[PDB]
Amino acid sequence: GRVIRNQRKGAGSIFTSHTRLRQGAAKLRTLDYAERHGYIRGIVKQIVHDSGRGAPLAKVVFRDPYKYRLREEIFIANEGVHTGQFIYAGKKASLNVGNVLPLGSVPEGTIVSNVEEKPGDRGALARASGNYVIIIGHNPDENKTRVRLPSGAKKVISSDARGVIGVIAGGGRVDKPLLKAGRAFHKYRLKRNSWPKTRGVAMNPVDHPHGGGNHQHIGKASTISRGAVSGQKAGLIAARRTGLLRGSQKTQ
């Protein structure tokens, strides 16, 4: 009967919509002949800050070619542009600063925005692709593209996307310690809650399968197997290494 606080997401209450503060999504509108190989132009004016974190959002509203309507669509903005600057991204034209081109019509060094990973389709039924323009070099070989990130993974996919060049002031926010503390509730009153990460040498005594009793010491390995039991998964999963990464790089 006494469960652990890893098996909670099955009530639909304290895990539901908790983000009044925000507005809309970020996925683009209807795709046509324009928003792909040929000619695609974007806009950015009211750079309203992204609610919940540190990012900009723009009121990218396109005059619908199919019908006289200008539905307000809050999309992701970028840093470097002022209050109003149209995108100059033409496949049959050229390239400048802050443009939107597929991952095939551009050479190495192309950090676009995130929207989709599939050859376009207004939010591909998937998403296991890139997080946006954030991409270095590509691959001239056919329509394939080999991306790479310092996270430690590889991926080979297509070379078509609707991401625009631009940056977001996020670097430094996590590099600068939460000095003036008082952050946990309003911290992750954002979308849900996942910041209690939470201890007790005697949190649940006549139990602790890990190891505790009456003294600060564990017993069993906190490395719970992935395919073994879904009733003991409390702590590390599928361990391999453990060390200390120093600041001095200069490696191979």
């Binding site: 310092p150 430690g152 993974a153 290494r241 060390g243 990464l245 120093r246 200069k250 490696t251 191979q252």
Partner: protein, 167 residues
């Protein structure tokens, strides 16, 4: 077990032996991986070699990269180092702790490949500057082409890291 024991005189002996021996398939790939691993621990060049190798290209080719992501930059620095060198202690200490000042106080010899040995020997006996300022840091590019015009083939034909390499 090679690198295993590997961690003497007879070492380098049978060393270079099976060395050139073992000298595509990443089983052996990651093997040599952990190899040079414990290696540097206690190749290197061949190290970052197989490095950029997997570079082009779960487990154990992956955690390796993770650790290697947290001579390169060190190379550049100690580069200018040996630079003014042949051209010391203080420099090394600055590039390097209480024992930093401990040193600060052939000793340093045993202390401490080819480059290193050469430098040491030269210093004991005495007991491209453009490249210098270059790797150091445009005005640099300036003095660069300056002395520039001022194997020349492969010469004119980072990249300078590879350059120092050939040098």
């Amino acid at each position: 077990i090679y690198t295993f024991f590997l961690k003497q005189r007879d070492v380098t002996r049978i060393m270079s032996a099976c060395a050139q021996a073992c000298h595509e398939v990443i089983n052996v790939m990651v093997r040599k991986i952990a190899d040079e691993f414990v290696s540097d621990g206690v190749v290197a060049a061949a190290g970052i070699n197989t490095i950029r190798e997997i570079c082009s290209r779960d487990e154990i080719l992956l955690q390796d990269l993770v650790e290697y992501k947290g001579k390169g930059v060190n190379m550049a620095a100690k580069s200018l180092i040996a630079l003014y060198r042949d051209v010391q202690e203080a420099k090394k200490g600055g590039k390097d702790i209480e024992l930093l000042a401990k040193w600060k106080k052939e000793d340093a010899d045993a202390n401490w490949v080819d480059v290193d040995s050469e430098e040491d020997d030269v210093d004991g006996e005495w007991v491209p500057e453009a490249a210098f300022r270059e790797i150091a840091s445009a005005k640099l590019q300036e003095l660069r082409n300056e002395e520039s015009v001022a194997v020349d083939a492969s010469t004119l034909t980072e990249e300078r890291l590879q350059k120092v390499l050939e040098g």
